[PDB]
Amino acid sequence: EPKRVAPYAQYLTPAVEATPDAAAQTKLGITAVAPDQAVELRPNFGEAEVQAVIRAAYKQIFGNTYILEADRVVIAESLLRNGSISVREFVRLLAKSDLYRDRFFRTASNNRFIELNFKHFLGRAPYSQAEIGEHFNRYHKSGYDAEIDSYIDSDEYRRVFGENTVPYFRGFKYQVGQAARGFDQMQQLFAGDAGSDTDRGIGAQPAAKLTFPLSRPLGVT
Amino acid sequence: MQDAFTKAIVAADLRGSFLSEQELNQLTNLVKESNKRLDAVNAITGNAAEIISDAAHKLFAEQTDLIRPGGNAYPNRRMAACLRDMEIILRYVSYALLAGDASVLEDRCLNGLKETYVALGTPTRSVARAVQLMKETAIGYVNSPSGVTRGDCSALVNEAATYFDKAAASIA
Amino acid sequence: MQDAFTKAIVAADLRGSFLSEQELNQLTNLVKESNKRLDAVNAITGNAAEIISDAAHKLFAEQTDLIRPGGNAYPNRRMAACLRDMEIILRYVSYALLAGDASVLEDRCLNGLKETYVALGTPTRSVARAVQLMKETAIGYVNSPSGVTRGDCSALVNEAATYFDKAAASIA
Amino acid sequence: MQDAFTKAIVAADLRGSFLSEQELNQLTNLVKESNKRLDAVNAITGNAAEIISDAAHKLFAEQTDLIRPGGNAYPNRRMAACLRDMEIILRYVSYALLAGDASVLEDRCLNGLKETYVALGTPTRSVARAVQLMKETAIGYVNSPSGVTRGDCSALVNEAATYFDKAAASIA
Amino acid sequence: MQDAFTKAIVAADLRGSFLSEQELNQLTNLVKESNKRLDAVNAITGNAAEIISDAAHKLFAEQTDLIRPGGNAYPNRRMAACLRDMEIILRYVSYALLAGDASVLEDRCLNGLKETYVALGTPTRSVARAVQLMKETAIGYVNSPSGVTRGDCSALVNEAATYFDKAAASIA
Amino acid sequence: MKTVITEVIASADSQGRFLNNTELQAANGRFQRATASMEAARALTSNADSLVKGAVQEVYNKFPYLTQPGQMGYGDTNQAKCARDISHYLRFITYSLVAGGTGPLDDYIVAGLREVNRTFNLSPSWYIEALKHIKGKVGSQLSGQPLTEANAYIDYCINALS
Amino acid sequence: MKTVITEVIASADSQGRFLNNTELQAANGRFQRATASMEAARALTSNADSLVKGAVQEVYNKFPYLTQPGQMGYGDTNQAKCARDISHYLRFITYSLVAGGTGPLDDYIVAGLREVNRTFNLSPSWYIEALKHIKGKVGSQLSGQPLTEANAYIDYCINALS
Amino acid sequence: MKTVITEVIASADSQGRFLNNTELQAANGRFQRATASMEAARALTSNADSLVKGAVQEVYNKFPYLTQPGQMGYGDTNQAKCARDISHYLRFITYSLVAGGTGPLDDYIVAGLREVNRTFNLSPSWYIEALKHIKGKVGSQLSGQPLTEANAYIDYCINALS
Amino acid sequence: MKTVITEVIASADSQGRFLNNTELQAANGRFQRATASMEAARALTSNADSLVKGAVQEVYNKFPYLTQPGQMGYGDTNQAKCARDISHYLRFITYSLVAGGTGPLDDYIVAGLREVNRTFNLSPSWYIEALKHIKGKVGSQLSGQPLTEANAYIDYCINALS
Ligand SMILES: *[C@H](C)[C@H]1/C(=C/c2[nH]c(/C=C3N=C(/C=C4\NC(=O)C(CC)=C4C)C(C)=C\3CCC(=O)O)c(CCC(=O)O)c2C)NC(=O)[C@@H]1C
Ligand SMILES: *[C@H](C)[C@H]1/C(=C/c2[nH]c(/C=C3N=C(/C=C4\NC(=O)C(CC)=C4C)C(C)=C\3CCC(=O)O)c(CCC(=O)O)c2C)NC(=O)[C@@H]1C
Ligand SMILES: *[C@H](C)[C@H]1/C(=C/c2[nH]c(/C=C3N=C(/C=C4\NC(=O)C(CC)=C4C)C(C)=C\3CCC(=O)O)c(CCC(=O)O)c2C)NC(=O)[C@@H]1C
Ligand SMILES: *[C@H](C)[C@H]1/C(=C/c2[nH]c(/C=C3N=C(/C=C4\NC(=O)C(CC)=C4C)C(C)=C\3CCC(=O)O)c(CCC(=O)O)c2C)NC(=O)[C@@H]1C
Ligand SMILES: *[C@H](C)[C@H]1/C(=C/c2[nH]c(/C=C3N=C(/C=C4\NC(=O)C(CC)=C4C)C(C)=C\3CCC(=O)O)c(CCC(=O)O)c2C)NC(=O)[C@@H]1C
């Protein structure tokens, strides 16, 4: 026979200005990528399962640009079947491709290229101007192959997606070490889900678009 | 993502309340139509290839320039992209139709699309046109199937329309 | 990165000069305080969990709506973030305190935080409030420990404050 | 993956033939049981936490040394793993139970497990034991529910057993 | 990783016991030597470049063929590697010396080294030789420094030796 | 938010393919079930309050000391909160029944559950009792599939809490 | 192989979570449908042959020139193959009905379809007619949901071919 | 295992460089401190037992209901465990003092703490009291830096537990 | 666009190095060949039309049924298109001769070839004949290296089409 019952009505009453949870996501259209599903290649993978990792990898690693029949890389994905190479090695083969060079690097400036490599190789955007410089020096000593290799072999790439996991957008959610500017810069690099990193409009890739960010003073507190 | 049910929930949540009896009855009714709803979707998916094929033919008969050198659908590579796009739009529309909600369509498919189109130089108006051409053909099937129990699908048909139109508008 | 020492260096470098004797004496005395400085840090880190816990309670007692349906701290998932953030800010502050320099705090933690908060729709003012609530609690510990040699920590206490405040300001 | 249906298909395929009428009748029957099958699964998933909790307690009461310094379940870190593992095995078992096929369990979970355990110095015997402890508890629920239509689940119960046992064996 | 202290701990842990007073006294005295220990390390690191340079010269004076076409240190590219490797080994040795424990050296550095050398066709014998050449030079510095308080370093010197030797052996 | 319908869309979408028969079959499942689910929700929604009172109460019987001064159960504010919270759990459960998926539960309640609870020193145990007590009551007002559904969701939380 | 059951397992498995109510609902859908599906398969399996004859035939009517010498339709070997092939399509379809998913179709027929067809200069068109003709016949022996199911799968191929 | 010495090695190692003056300075720090640390350990090690008794006890005073039948504190087995556990905490703390880093604590105690505690329904709270009570006693046997060190480590756990 | 010159630049650029002798050698190759290439282009450009008529025509002889009503070859629109298309192929070929690389061909014609052709049901076969017929005619107006070059490119398409 309980009867006292504190009313508890006030706690239930809605806030002055209310947002659905995931309102922040639906604005900014990061809804799809915010928490982002990981795809993992598993042992004794089926024929459909592999097809899905490939599908994923070409969407992330390549830009969200369109891979036509001709574009696809037969030899690399044959090795991915029959487990000759892991997905981490599959990604490395994709990144060193006429196709990856043709888009991305050959038309871009090294600032736009390095900023693109961050993102496709690791969801984050570049945290600081140093990171850009570190990679630009690496490229000048040792060329495009060593440049690419440095992202895939980076400790950060390995810890989040060692091997067997296709890279996903880790940006847009807080990552240890992140540094602020993460969230802001990732919104510039990532348009909507319809947007892509294409050059087809006018041959050149656009200019870096994270150079001015990356070098902004802190606003007078 | 979102859909008809989930949506109603969320609304209810902001009020802070259990679902209104009235509101349940929306969902209750919605369920009842399911079967119709499903068949509608099934019709699109079944005819997909053709819907597109068709729309395209008509699109290019009208807007000859797209396929002329200097136009946006020339050369092959470009043409191919345009076909892919049409399919994607369609695909989404269908998804929405099942969900019973525009959202999915708006977020994944339409979001960013205008800007892309702009950057490419693709003529948004023509895109929109295509979407409509598709619409009409699609409805055609939804509305005239074979071996289905005869009854009224109008309600669904109209909602379908709307989805197509949201697309047309946001692209345009 | 930077800290008290490194900073003075850098200045000297642009003049192109060896360090002024006067300038050494800044650093010389800075060293002397070390022990105090350390204990200060130790106090924060030791009480971390609590500092936050406390501040939160007070934050939510004041701004009831945050925890009401539709508010920014509701539901659980959001709440969690809010707690996480508090912690981070704190963590940085501590770092600064050890370094003897705002920089570290400004660059990794503060810079662009406001904008993030804006984009999310999280109410910057409330965040700032939280930071202060934290501040007071923290000082509380810094300033009232047990088993430490009794002496004057004011100098450090104030610098601590400033760090917290830079935070509050730039977020707000 | 594989499951009961797909399996039968594949066999049929290599013969190059339509499905045998006899073979259909396996599947036809399998369908009839579905509802039972489902409830079984539902029972496990619903009680998951408990099943484990329980089994563990008993495991550690028996093999005291596992939790003593120098044992394999010590210290915390290890203990955690041990719990996690138990759970996983369970998870898979359930999966299998639904599929109506061991495969999934064997291929994702059991394959290589023995050797791992060996290399680490985990005592395979004890692992196996745990699996059984789990088995019994689990069956307990499957077999004694409330608000389910009363009938005979034996057939399912035994198949469940087998899955657990495949596990026990391959680990051991 | 491991080092002198951590190690003793771990042992104690498996017994399940607090550290024996006897055992503390190992560590207590180990501390006392610190200063010596440090200087030792400092001496190596300070002379690093040279140590190597030197050893190399001697290595190549002895085994002329390494630097002849068809040898393993020819051409430049290879030579470079060979130098690099020597250095690494040294680096590790130093690390060990500080830790007061072989482990770090064994686990990061020596493990797999032999096999690599083998697969490449690098002559393990010669590698080992180099390591010794290094050893002697290094001791040279450890034992004859400038501005250090005069005292007995033998104990450290011998331990240094051992590290070098573990290296020599496992490579060879 | 994870419901049957959203998932199949998602899966379809990932592979880049139209909704084919495979997925619709699944959808159909959700819709057939709904009738039972919906029924259950109507039942909980109506008795809400009474369920809540009963639960809160129970907790105190189970853990008398909570009501003593200087404890968490003590002083009205806390009691109010305690009530509020359980209401929520219930609310969401209904939602999930109707939405035909755990989604609503996952996103509101489950995500971040642990840390919240840790930071405010809410003992999972409590909640659990609440739920159990509920489950027991519900085990009268409902029957057959409607019941079964109700349980599933209730449990789902128990497991998440524990 | 993609069936309803395998998928939900897969999805569950990826996230690393137990099968909860969400997935079972889906499964249930598959099982309810099965009765109709299975019926359809029994019907196709029985009339197989007759369907095949009719189809092959049709194709020739539709594309007379194939039967002329020096063409593909000409000379028995080719006709035999043509028959064989269609049999296959059918076979798989039945499989898919029973498996309750497109899986069987995808892996046998669809994957690699294009390239095979290109390298041997098989015109998709042909196959299509075959199928259509079939669909029309099936549209007599079956009715209601059984029919509906049959269609779905038949079409699925048409779309893949085109 | 994270100690001062191991870390500097690690950092040196990552960049691929020799230990230079920077790191040695740090190492020196560890060694200078040791004298105090070591002292503290000798003190805890000696009074271990007495500290443990006192703590266990305390917990029961703080949470009387634990000792009632049907609870966790009840029946000797549990008491034994309770003792054991606290011993452990202490043991490790000493270790950490001597090792000159949190390392020992992190790997034995902290990693996996939560889940263990969840699955067996050990309330962090309890442990905490134990520790606090300890801290208070230690606050007599020790003084100056030795004391300070002892605290640091004790706390470190409090924070990890909470 | 892939030409000899662009490639060597690209390769040089990737490695990050100045153009050394290696690449120039290659470039030189392109330039010396050009004289022949250029000649070939002048020849094709001039006879374009005649080549096109002849080809289109051929196709119809090869596939009479196309010209029947209700087919694709039927009605002027289609014929016009057919002409247009082949013109294109030719146009590009000339381009490629002059550019000294397949580049122009790849980007205009080849990329996306398949899908276009699939969606509109253009049979590669047709195009091929066109080309072959062309190749045969070209095999009169040209000779020696000029000829050789012409072939290479013409073929390149045949292979891409097939
Ligand atoms: C066809 C009806 C019309 C047309 C379309 C068109 N689009 C492109 C190129 C792109 N289109 C997209 C669009 C999308 N990506 C997505 O994921 C979605 C759905 C979510 C869409 C709609 C993109 C990203 C591209 C770039 C492709 C790439 O990265 O290579 C083109 C081709 C332009 C080009 O030169 O590539 C065309 C022609 N344009 C028309 O003229 C038609 C009216
Ligand atoms: C609407 C565009 C056209 C139409 C539809 C229509 N359908 C039904 C009934 C059913 N349709 C289905 C179909 C499915 N149910 C499923 O579970 C699946 C996926 C596996 C499908 C494809 C079913 C099962 C039914 C019930 C039995 C039946 O066939 O009748 C109706 C009848 C009304 C109702 O409420 O069911 C109608 C009207 N019919 C038209 O005339 C429209 C053009
Ligand atoms: C708590 C005092 C207030 C609060 C906080 C809050 N934050 C988020 C979400 C995010 N918080 C951050 C913040 C950071 N990113 C960084 O890099 C740093 C340090 C440099 C911080 C502090 C980020 C990136 C997010 C978004 C992604 C994520 O969730 O990790 C929320 C959730 C809002 C949302 O819709 O996501 C909240 C609630 N808001 C309040 O109500 C308190 C006043
Ligand atoms: C200031 C907030 C409080 C305070 C500080 C205070 N500390 C000391 C002296 C020492 N503090 C330490 C502490 C450390 N030294 C270290 O090496 C480390 C890291 C391992 C710590 C934590 C030490 C060793 C000393 C020297 C001996 C001692 O403890 O006294 C003083 C004394 C005066 C000085 O300038 O150092 C003071 C005042 N006292 C306050 O008023 C607050 C409680
Ligand atoms: C078996 C271990 C125990 C048992 C089972 C049992 N169940 C039924 C019947 C049903 N159970 C369900 C369950 C579900 N159907 C679904 O769609 C889902 C997921 C959403 C579930 C959980 C259903 C719907 C039925 C049919 C109707 C009913 O009222 O049960 C039976 C009856 C036999 C049958 O197959 O219909 C039985 C025997 N009963 C026991 O005593 C066993 C311990």
Ligand SMILES: *[C@H](C)[C@H]1/C(=C/c2[nH]c(/C=C3N=C(/C=C4\NC(=O)C(CC)=C4C)C(C)=C\3CCC(=O)O)c(CCC(=O)O)c2C)NC(=O)[C@@H]1C
């Ligand atoms: C120098 C005294 C002798 C020598 C060395 C030499 N080494 C290589 C190549 C490699 N050596 C190593 C070394 C390491 N691998 C490890 O894991 C470690 C410890 C962490 C070391 C020190 C490795 C990895 C290689 C292969 C890859 C590389 O490029 O270094 C060579 C070159 C072999 C070749 O054929 O290119 C040489 C020459 N060999 C001599 O002639 C000396 C006796």
Ligand SMILES: *[C@H](C)[C@H]1/C(=C/c2[nH]c(/C=C3N=C(/C=C4\NC(=O)C(CC)=C4C)C(C)=C\3CCC(=O)O)c(CCC(=O)O)c2C)NC(=O)[C@@H]1C
């Ligand atoms: C041993 C190979 C040689 C030797 C060593 C030696 N050193 C000392 C004493 C000290 N050495 C140092 C050096 C350091 N301490 C630090 O903190 C650092 C890092 C920044 C270094 C490099 C210090 C501080 C001392 C203490 C003060 C002093 O220098 O006297 C001794 C004296 C005995 C002792 O252990 O203190 C000795 C013997 N001397 C030899 O004869 C060897 C050749």
Ligand SMILES: *[C@H](C)[C@H]1/C(=C/c2[nH]c(/C=C3N=C(/C=C4\NC(=O)C(CC)=C4C)C(C)=C\3CCC(=O)O)c(CCC(=O)O)c2C)NC(=O)[C@@H]1C
């Ligand atoms: C009831 C069994 C016990 C009790 C509970 C109690 N809860 C709080 C505070 C909170 N409880 C929650 C729980 C939720 N809030 C949400 O937003 C959600 C998701 C929708 C849940 C499940 C939260 C987040 C809080 C913290 C924020 C707040 O200020 O409420 C308290 C107060 C705790 C405090 O330290 O102030 C209490 C006491 N009260 C009882 O009597 C039972 C023991």
Ligand SMILES: *[C@H](C)[C@H]1/C(=C/c2[nH]c(/C=C3N=C(/C=C4\NC(=O)C(CC)=C4C)C(C)=C\3CCC(=O)O)c(CCC(=O)O)c2C)NC(=O)[C@@H]1C
């Ligand atoms: C029938 C519509 C026309 C026809 C057919 C025809 N087919 C082939 C050759 C092949 N057809 C297939 C098709 C399949 N084989 C498979 O494995 C599968 C999936 C399981 C299918 C659908 C294949 C692979 C071949 C190539 C291998 C082979 O020929 O044995 C031919 C032979 C053509 C040739 O050898 O070049 C023919 C003629 N012929 C007719 O009568 C119709 C016009």
Ligand SMILES: *[C@H](C)[C@H]1/C(=C/c2[nH]c(/C=C3N=C(/C=C4\NC(=O)C(CC)=C4C)C(C)=C\3CCC(=O)O)c(CCC(=O)O)c2C)NC(=O)[C@@H]1C
């Ligand atoms: C003491 C404050 C309370 C209490 C504790 C108690 N603990 C258990 C069981 C376990 N305790 C631990 C803790 C550890 N084991 C480790 O390996 C480590 C790291 C060194 C720790 C800290 C563990 C893991 C267990 C689980 C199983 C085991 O055998 O250890 C119990 C038994 C509870 C149970 O469900 O079995 C109890 C009661 N006892 C009291 O009286 C206090 C309330």
Ligand SMILES: *[C@H](C)[C@H]1/C(=C/c2[nH]c(/C=C3N=C(/C=C4\NC(=O)C(CC)=C4C)C(C)=C\3CCC(=O)O)c(CCC(=O)O)c2C)NC(=O)[C@@H]1C
């Ligand atoms: C000629 C051998 C046959 C024929 C051809 C024919 N082609 C089309 C349609 C198209 N053909 C092409 C070809 C190209 N367009 C390009 O942009 C390029 C790259 C530069 C090529 C190679 C394209 C893309 C189309 C589609 C768009 C369009 O309208 O042109 C048709 C019409 C098909 C239709 O469905 O209307 C035809 C008939 N006609 C004949 O007589 C031969 C059989």
